[PDB]
Design a protein around this ligand. Structure first.
Ligand SMILES: CC(=O)NCCCC[C@H](N)C(=O)O
Length: 140
């Protein structure tokens, strides 16, 4: 018996483009998944999948190594499914978040937002428990 907690940070940045794109997109934005300072989530994250709006081509964006991030231009915010796939052999294999990707509108300063997620793994296998603790996971 034991439980291991690890921390994830999902976030995004958005600002007006000085010059809109050829499509006339108003904003540059960037969405990421990272660990807190001095934590290496690569130890237990196999890959992160960023499910972009259907407008963007190849909207399935995969980061298999850090940095787990996507940079694009846009005209409006949307709901971005983000899938964090674990280096786990048993369940759960992944965790899904629906990320609120919103833009700074009507001359508000740039957007720079962070969403902190705590994952609780009950009775992980030996192999996966090492990866969690190597990433800076803590037993409770
Ligand atoms: C590039 C860009 O801005 N794409 C559109 C994103 C918003 C789509 C719409 N508001 C929706 O939520 O489906």
């Amino acid at each position: 018996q034991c439980t291991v907690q690890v921390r994830l940070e999902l976030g995004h940045r958005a600002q007006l483009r000085k010059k809109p794109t050829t499509e006339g997109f108003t904003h540059d934005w960037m969405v990421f998944v990272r660990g807190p300072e001095q934590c290496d989530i690569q130890h237990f994250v196999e890959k992160v999948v960023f499910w972009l709006h259907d407008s963007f081509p190849k909207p399935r964006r995969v980061c298999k190594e850090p940095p787990y991030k996507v940079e694009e231009s846009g005209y409006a915010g949307f709901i971005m499914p983000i899938e964090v796939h674990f280096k786990n052999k048993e369940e759960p294999r992944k965790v899904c978040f629906t990320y609120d990707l919103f833009l700074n509108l009507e001359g508000n300063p740039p957007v720079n937002h962070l969403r902190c997620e705590k994952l609780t793994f009950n009775n992980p296998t030996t192999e996966f428990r090492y990866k969690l603790l190597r990433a800076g996971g803590v037993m409770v």
